[PDB]
Each structure stands twice: as structure tokens, then as C-alpha cells.
Design brief:
part of a larger assembly; 2 chains; A: 607 residues; mainly alpha; two-stranded antiparallel sheet; 27 helices; B: 338 residues; four-stranded mixed beta sheet; 19 helices; 4% strand; elongated; DNA-binding; dna binding protein/dna; DNA repair; DNA binding protein; DNA BINDING PROTEIN-DNA complex
Chain lengths: 607, 338
DNA sequence: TTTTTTTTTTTTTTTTTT
């Protein structure tokens, strides 16, 4: 009776002809949510059946197809009716807390193979609504802390994020999680040490205090010493630490030195601090082999990225003493020697053909990805240093030429066999903030003090197509997962502001400079920059309709209701399609036409 | 005027007289490498260490001076570690400060929370956690074994749980053996030792032996520690051993030895069993098999019916099955009205 | 030579009959 109602409602909402005839009927959804309101008084007889309907709707209609309209939209709408039944029933009925809350948790903890995002959404809602009403039904939480070791890692990250508003207000629940995380820090399974690392990074990220406030500082220092020990484990726990240390700084500034030395000593295992020694990172120590099983430990690319981000935040925020200049000149020596290194210092392309048969080709492939990541980090660094110096842009070009040489190496080796590996399309190490700033500086910027220095970058067309490729990759990551890979890529407001800025830049490059300026070559007619800007526009508009649905007004204001703004944008795009059509081109790029009608189909859903 | 305080002043730490924290002029690594090269390039090399640590122990005879030496320093340039941890960061100083840290720990057995409510021997063992380098690992192990023997009960409960922080990743075998040999004698310390034994790196056939050892003496445990031990036993089941341990637990648990003194502990224990079978389904089927297969023994306890009602009231696929089993206990006379 | 689309197959879910 609930699924039928949602099918009926979808059928009427999709068609005006049925809206004219049928007068607006109350649906079973609105009736059920009226029952839950009505039951406040004395109807306790009803409410134990409300709870069972809630969990039957969620259990029966939750996702599985990601681990279409008819299998999706009247099942998405029933499963979100379930959570609405249980969340409204939880709020007013003060006795079926611990019957929802120990059954939500019992489905989150124990299932962990079937998708359980809906229960983590519901548990986030339940907690966030009132941890003041959950400190009377709290022990149902701290009995699922004891099961935290055996869960997969994403469930542990998601469950800790969800239950975080309970950890803000309650000190007993925080000191009950600390005993579990400290106990599982040493446990013999692999995932238990990852879950301990995740939980300690989140307790350092979101909290200052963990009684005199000298011991809180030494507790932070002891946690940070345990995480410094975890820095000598396997590759993924190291990688989790490298993403986390930036946000540890950016909240608790006081741990500055205790993070930065922790990276700098870790940098000095893989750095050679003498000039005129041409492979300026020891790439051998990053790969361990034990009887033909061959694997990575200490990714240099993410280490350098974390160092450079923390160093930029150290310059811009902390200073407005004689430590950061050491790491500056270390990074500058890495740039200066990575410019005049070439490819036999890491024995690439000549001695090993990166074969996925032998261990040596594995080693050289890992080496190649490491050098690519290092060059991307140093591109971002050299941009970040100065106010548009020519010399640093020459170094940016030289580093990008090294990266592009390694990419053209790796692309030909995916030319004998297939491109079945998704490891060259693996993430860039440029933040979305940097790609936004780089494209604003490349296209729009016409300040005469920066023109002579940007003109060496504009003259490199392959650099500009790499830049828009990276921007398209960040929008694709925002669509596919919830959020993007870099720093500040888990805060929705920061991805929103960077989405607005990319939209503005790609619109200015699309509308102002036409398509018919193609003076490169006939291989670049499906790969032109004015095509890629329209493609990134399409991805941005789709992603902003999906994720940032409540903000579309303040999405369009950055480019009066949503109708006039959307109408002006449609006027731009449909003028573009009109001049594309009435030009009467015999070659006729139909790709640009398909993208224009796709972006118009995206836009016309707002009117 | 002592060699210790002069070397610490020229190294760059202001020694406070014993109220507030010690100040720092330079960074931590700067001070450590500075005192390292100071003791290196100084003449009379194999005696300045002994002169230094004799000056150190003569300085930490005082309560306030030693209490501030344990506590963490102050940054002038915004808060860092302690002088003892920084001083133990240097490998050539390490074993002397280890020895003169453990020799004065029996001084603080009966001393407990006088003025600032800072308990001293937990602060003494706090400085050994997460050492970057350990020289004397076997000697440190034997020193904490002598300490873990001679200690008060609260203090040995306290130091026993900070064991995996203190030790590295080598010496866990003899520690496991000595802890199990302490476990077979002392039953007051059952609760932390098992806590630590999974948290070290032992071989699994040691853990199954210790699990059998603690299930054997399950009747001789005080009331406050019983839900914690049963929590460990239920948390430490696999898929393969589960019915044997569950049957042992069914045969050993009575509630005619523990009956606001016992009713609260029984409440907590049934919370532990309820929550264990809730978040893990095979313990319910294991426990029904452990009751149903008890056919010959007409010594059925209270625990059999309370567990049949609890597996009924929780996970609700079992209902018909516990409806069936309970019918076959009543016709057969095995469960009766008394 | 690679990427996309189309067609076929398999698996899962729901309904209807014994």
C-alpha cells in the first residue's frame, strides 16, 4: 500500500494530462506521517507497529544495485519513508528509543557486506537531532564500540562520523571510545589497526580536550607518538596518516611542530641531502620484496603533498621560527634536481619496459607513478611560491614536461595490451582549490604584471589541456563518490565554492572564445579546449543538480528566482547552438551539438 | 653548581625550583642533539655519564623537583614533552635513567595523591611509553617483572595494562609466559592480564590454553569481574570452537555462587550475554544446541530457562525452535514447575 | 588501435498454481 502510492504519485507528477483530470489525493505517505503525529497522546499500541513498518520498508527497499526510474524511485521513496517513520517515531515516543537505536546499530554492525548507507543516514539523523535525548539511551552506542575492530574500514569511518555529535557533548562516551581504539591499536588483524588510526585521527581532528589542561596536551602528544609509530607499518596506514595530518594541523594548531618534524624525519629516510646527485629521492627503499611478492611502502607523492600543503598553511596562517626554511630549501633542492634529472636516474624506459610479467617491471611502474606524483606536487608548489615569477613558471613547464614524458611512456605500454588498469587515470595530487586558481589565472587573468610570466604557460597548449583534464577529473570524482580526493575535498561547502569558480571560468572560456579558432591539427578536433570546457560545464550542472539541490539559486547568482537566471543561461547556450547550426559546416562537429543539447536538457529541468 | 644542572643550562632548559613547569629556549630535537654533542666532545668520556646521572638522582631526591622533572616542559616561543622523555631520547643516557627511574619507584608505593592529585608511579611508568629506541629491552623487561611482582595491587593493575605501549615488538614470549604464571596464582588480576594478552603478539595456541585456564577457574572470580571475563570469552570465539566453549560456559556458569550486591552484577552479566547474542547470531544456535543436547543430566539449572527466555525475547527466527526444545524438556520431565 | 553501443545471456525477483 506504500509502494503503490509512490508509483501513482510518480505517474501523475510526470504528466500534466493526468494533473488536469485527477484532483489532488492525499497519499499513504502523508497518512502514515499523520498517524505518527496522532500517536503522541496514548496510542502506545500503535507505535510498536510503526517501528516494525519502518524497518520493513527500509530492510526491503534499501539499495543494492550500487554496492533507471521504476526499480529506483518508488523504492528510494519507500526506504526514505521508512527512515522518516523511525525518525519521527524516535523523537516523541520516549520508550522506543533503544528499540530503534539498538536495531539501527545491530544492522550497521552485523551486515557490513550488503549496503547499509541508509541506516548510517538514519543513525546520523537520530544522533544529530538530539544527543541531548540520546544520553538517556547511550549504552546501546558504547556496546557497538566493542565491535569496531571487525568492521570494514569505510563502515568504521562512516559510523564514527555519524556518531560524532554524541562524542561532542558526552565525555564518558569519548573516554569509552579511547579505550577501544587504544586496545585495537595493537590487534593482530590488519583492519583493527586501520580503524584505530581512523578513530584517533578523527578524535584529534574534531577535538581539543581528550582536571588540569596540561594532561590533555600530553595525551595529544602520546596519541601523536602512537601514530608516529604506525608510520612504520604498511602503505595504506601510512596513506591514511598523510591525508589526516593536514586536518590535524588545521584544527589543533598547537600540534604544528609535532606533526611537521614527524613528516620531516620521515622525509629524510628517502631524501639524499647532497647536491649534484641526480636521482634526488631513493626510490628503492619505497618497494619491499619477500619471495616474489612485491609491494609499496611509503608513497613519496602523498608524503610530499602532505608536507607541501602543511607548509603552505604554515606560511599563510601561522606566521601572520628557523624550521620551515629548512623544509623550503629541501623542497627547492628537490625541484632543482628533478628538473635536470632524466629517466635513467630512476632507470626508466631504457633498462625496464615496465612489464606486468616480472617483478622488475612492477618496481619500475611503481617508480614511474611515484615520479609522476612528485612532479605534480612540485608543480603546485612552484605555482604557490611567488607572485607569478618567470623562472618558477619555467620550472613548472620543465616538471610538466617530465610528467608528460612519463605519461607518454605509460600510455604506449597500455598500447600493446589493453587499458584494463585504472592506475594512470588514478587521482592527481592537485587540490581542487589549486585547479580552480590555475584555470582562473590561465584563461581570465589579463593583469599586465602577470602576462609576461603566464605567456610561457599559455603557449603550452598541452599544459592547458592537462589542467582542464584535472578539473574534469575532480568533477567526475564529485559525481561518482560523494566528494573529491584532495585536501578540503570532504567539506561540501568547499566543493561548492570550487564548483562555482570552475563554472565561471569554463563559461568564460566557452562563450567568449568560440570553437572556430582551431589552428593546431585535425587530431585535436574531438580534443579541443573549447570542447572540454563545455564537457566540464555539463558535469558541473549535473553534479550541482544532484548534490547541491538546495543551493541552485546561490549557484546561479555566482554566474529574482531561478527561472530568470536559468533563462539567461539557456539564452547563452541556445544562442551557441544556433550559431553552431546556422554556420552550415559540412564537417559538422556533432559532439559539441550533443553536449549542448545535454546541457540544455540539464538546464531546462529548473524552469 | 652540579655538573647536571650546568650541562642542562648550557643545553637550553631552565630548571624550575619546583612549582611551575621547566622552560625551553630551543626546540626538542635541537636540545637533544645539543646535549648529545656536548657529552660527546667533552673529555673524560666514560665517567661524565655516571657523574651526570649521580647529579640527576641527587637533584630528584626532592619531591617537587622530581615531580616537575616527570611533568612536561614549557615552550617560550605552544606546549611540548618532559625532560625525562627528552633525556631518555638519547641512547647513551637511556639505561642509567632506566635504572634510577626503577630504583626510586618502591619509594612511592604507599604515597598516593597528597597535594596536586598527581599519582607519582603512574607518572614514572608514563615516561617509558612509546620509546623511539630501546637499548636495554631484556633488562627493562626483567626490571618491570620484578616491579610487577613486588607492586601494590592497584599499581600492578596499572602498570600491567601499559605493557604493550612500553615493550617493543620482540620480547612478547617470556612476558606472555610470566603473565600466565602470575595468572595461575593471582585471581584478583584475571581481568587486565587477558586484556593485555590479546594486545601483545602471542601465538594463538597460547591464547586458547589461557582461555581454557580461565574457564577452568570460572567459579573462583569475584562478582565485579565476572561480566568482563564472560565478555572476553564470548568476544574470543571463532566459528569452529564456538560450540565447545559455549557448552563449557553453559556447564560452568551457575548463579548459585553470586546471588544491590549480586542482583546488579547479574543484571550486568545478562546484559553482556544479551548484547553478545544480538550482535552475533551463532552464539544463540550454539547455546540452544548446548541446552538441547543436555538430555541425560536432569541437573538442569535456572540458567537453562533464563537463557531459553532471553534467546526467545531477542533474535526471533529461533522462536519455533525454542518452542520445540522447551516442549521436549517438559514431557521428558527435565524442566519442571519448581 | 581503442571506445562505445547493441545484443544476448544470466540472475534475481515476483506471481501464480499445486
Amino acid at each position: 500500500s506504500v509502494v503503490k502510492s509512490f508509483k501513482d504519485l510518480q505517474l501523475l507528477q510526470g504528466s500534466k494530462f493526468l494533473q488536469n483530470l485527477v484532483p489532488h489525493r492525499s497519499y499513504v505517505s502523508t497518512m502514515i506521517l499523520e498517524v505518527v503525529k496522532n500517536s503522541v497522546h496514548s496510542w502506545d499500541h500503535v507505535t510498536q507497529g510503526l517501528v516494525e513498518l519502518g524497518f520493513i520498508l527500509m530492510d526491503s527497499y534499501g539499495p543494492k544495485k550500487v554496492l533507471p526510474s521504476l526499480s529506483r524511485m518508488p523504492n528510494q521513496h519507500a526506504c526514505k519513508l521508512g527512515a522518516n517513520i523511525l525518525l519521527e517515531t524516535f523523537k516523541i515516543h520516549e520508550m522506543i528509543r533503544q528499540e530503534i537505536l539498538e536495531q539501527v546499530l545491530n544492522r550497521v554492525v552485523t551486515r557490513a557486506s550488503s549496503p547499509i548507507s541508509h541506516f548510517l543516514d538514519l543513525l546520523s539523523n537520530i544522533v544529530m537531532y538530539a544527543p541531548l535525548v540520546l544520553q538517556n539511551c547511550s549504552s546501546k552506542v558504547t556496546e557497538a564500540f566493542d565491535y569496531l575492530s571487525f568492521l570494514p574500514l569505510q563502515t568504521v569511518q562512516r559510523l564514527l562520523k555519524a556518531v560524532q555529535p554524541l562524542l561532542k557533548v558526552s565525555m564518558s562516551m569519548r573516554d569509552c571510545l579511547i579505550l577501544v581504539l587504544r586496545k585495537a591499536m595493537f590487534a593482530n588483524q590488519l583492519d583493527a589497526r586501520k580503524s584505530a588510526v581512523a578513530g584517533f585521527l578523527l578524535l584529534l581532528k574534531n577535538f581539543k580536550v581528550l582536571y588540569n589542561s596540561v594532561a590533555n596536551e600530553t595525551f595529544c602528544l602520546e596519541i601523536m607518538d602512537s601514530l608516529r609509530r604506525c608510520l612504520s607499518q604498511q602503505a595504506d596506514v601510512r596513506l591514511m596518516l598523510y591525508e589526516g595530518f593536514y586536518d590535524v594541523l588545521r584544527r589543533n594548531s598547537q600540534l604544528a611542530n609535532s606533526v611537521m618534524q614527524t613528516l620531516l624525519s620521515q622525509l629524510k629516510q628517502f631524501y639524499e641531502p647532497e647536491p649534484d646527485l641526480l636521482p634526488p629521492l631513493k626510490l628503492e627503499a619505497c618497494i619491499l620484496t619477500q619471495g616474489d611478492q612485491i609491494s609499496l611502502q611509503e608513497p613519496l607523492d602523498y608524503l610530499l603533498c602532505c608536507i607541501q600543503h602543511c607548509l603552505a598553511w604554515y606560511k599563510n596562517t601561522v606566521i601572520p621560527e628557523a624550521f620551515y626554511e629548512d623544509l623550503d630549501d629541501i623542497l627547492e633542492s628537490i625541484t632543482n634536481r628533478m628538473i635536470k634529472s632524466e629517466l635513467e636516474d630512476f632507470e626508466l624506459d631504457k633498462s625496464a619496459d615496465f612489464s606486468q610479467s616480472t617483478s622488475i617491471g612492477i618496481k619500475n611502474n611503481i617508480s614511474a607513478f611515484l615520479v609522476m606524483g612528485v612532479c605534480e606536487v612540485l608543480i603546485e608548489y612552484n605555482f604557490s611560491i611567488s607572485s607569478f615569477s618567470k623562472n618558477r613558471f619555467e620550472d613548472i613547464l620543465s616538471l610538466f614536461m617530465c610528467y608528460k614524458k612519463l605519461s607518454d611512456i605509460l600510455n604506449e605500454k597500455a598500447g600493446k595490451a589493453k587499458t584494463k588498469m585504472a592506475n594512470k587515470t588514478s587521482d592527481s595530487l592537485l587540490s581542487m582549490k589549486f585547479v580552480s586558481s590555475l584555470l582562473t589565472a590561465l584563461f581570465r587573468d589579463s593583469i599586465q604584471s602577470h602576462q609576461e610570466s603566464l605567456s610561457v604557460l599559455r603557449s603550452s597548449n598541452e599544459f592547458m589541456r592537462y589542467a582542464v583534464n584535472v578539473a574534469l577529473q575532480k568533477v567526475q570524482q564529485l559525481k561518482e563518490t560523494g566528494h573529491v580526493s584532495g585536501p578540503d575535498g570532504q567539506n561540501p561547502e568547499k566543493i561548492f565554492q570550487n564548483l562555482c569558480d570552475l563554472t565561471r571560468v569554463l563559461l568564460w572560456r566557452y562563450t567568449s572564445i568560440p570553437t572556430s579558432v582551431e589552428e593546431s591539427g585535425k587530431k585535436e578536433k574531438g580534443k579541443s579546449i573549447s570542447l572540454l570546457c563545455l564537457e566540464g560545464l555539463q558535469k558541473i550542472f549535473s553534479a550541482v543538480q544532484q548534490f547541491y539541490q538546495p543551493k541552485i539559486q546561490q549557484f546561479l547568482r555566482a554566474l529574482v528566482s531561478v527561472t530568470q537566471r536559468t533563462a539567461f543561461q539557456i539564452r547563452q547556450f541556445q544562442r551557441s547552438l544556433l550559431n553552431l547550426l546556422s554556420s552550415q559546416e559540412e564537417d559538422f562537429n556533432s559532439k559539441e551539438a550533443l553536449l549542448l543539447v545535454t546541457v540544455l536538457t540539464s538546464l531546462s529541468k529548473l524552469l | 653548581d652540579s655538573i647536571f644542572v650546568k650541562l642542562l643550562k648550557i643545553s637550553g632548559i631552565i630548571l624550575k625550583t619546583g612549582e611551575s613547569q621547566n622552560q625551553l629556549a630551543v626546540d626538542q630535537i635541537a636540545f637533544q642533539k645539543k646535549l648529545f654533542q656536548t657529552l660527546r666532545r667533552h673529555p673524560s668520556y666514560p665517567k661524565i655519564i655516571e657523574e651526570f646521572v649521580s647529579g640527576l638522582e641527587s637533584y630528584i631526591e626532592d619531591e617537587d623537583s622530581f615531580r616537575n622533572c616527570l611533568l612536561s616542559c614549557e615552550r617560550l616561543q605552544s606546549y611540548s614533552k618532559s625532560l625525562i622523555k627528552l633525556l631518555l631520547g638519547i641512547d647513551i643516557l637511556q639505561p642509567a635513567i632506566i635504572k634510577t627511574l626503577f630504583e626510586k619507584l618502591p619509594e612511592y608505593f604507599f604515597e598516593n595523591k597528597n597535594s596536586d592529585e598527581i599519582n607519582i608511579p603512574r607518572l614514572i611508568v608514563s615516561q617509558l611509553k612509546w620509546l623511539d629506541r630501546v637499548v636495554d629491552g631484556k633488562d627493562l623487561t626483567t626490571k618491570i617483572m620484578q616491579l610487577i611482582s613486588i607492586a601494590p595491587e592497584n599499581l600492578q593493575h596499572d602498570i600491567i595494562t601499559s605493557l604493550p605501549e612500553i615493550l617493543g615488538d620482540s620480547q612478547h614470549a617470556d612476558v606472555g609466559k610470566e603473565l600466565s604464571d602470575l595468572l595461575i596464582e593471582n585471581t584478583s588480576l584475571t581481568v587486565p592480564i587477558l586484556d593485555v594478552l590479546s594486545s601483545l603478539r602471542l601465538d594463538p595456541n597460547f591464547l586458547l590454553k589461557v582461555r581454557q585456564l580461565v574457564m577452568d577457574k570460572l567459579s573462583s572470580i569475584r562478582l565485579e569481574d565476572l561480566p568482563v571475563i564472560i565478555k572476553f570469552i564470548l568476544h574470543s570465539v571463532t566459528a569452529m570452537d564456538t560450540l565447545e566453549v559455549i557448552s563449557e560456559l553453559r556447564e560452568k556458569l551457575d548463579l548459585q555462587h553470586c546471588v544491590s550486591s549480586g542482583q546488579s552484577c547479574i543484571i550486568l552479566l545478562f546484559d553482556v550475554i544479551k548484547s553478545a547474542i544480538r550482535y552475533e547470531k551463532t552464539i544463540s544456535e550454539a547455546w540452544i544446541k548446548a541446552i538441547e543436547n543436555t538430555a541425560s543430566v536432569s541437573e538442569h539449572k535456572v540458567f537453562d530457562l533464563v537463557m531459553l527466555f532471553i534467546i526467545y525475547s531477542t533474535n526471533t527466527q529461533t522462536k519455533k525452535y525454542i518452542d520445540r526444545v522447551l516442549r521436549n524438556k517438559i514431557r521428558s520431565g527435565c524442566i519442571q514447575e519448581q
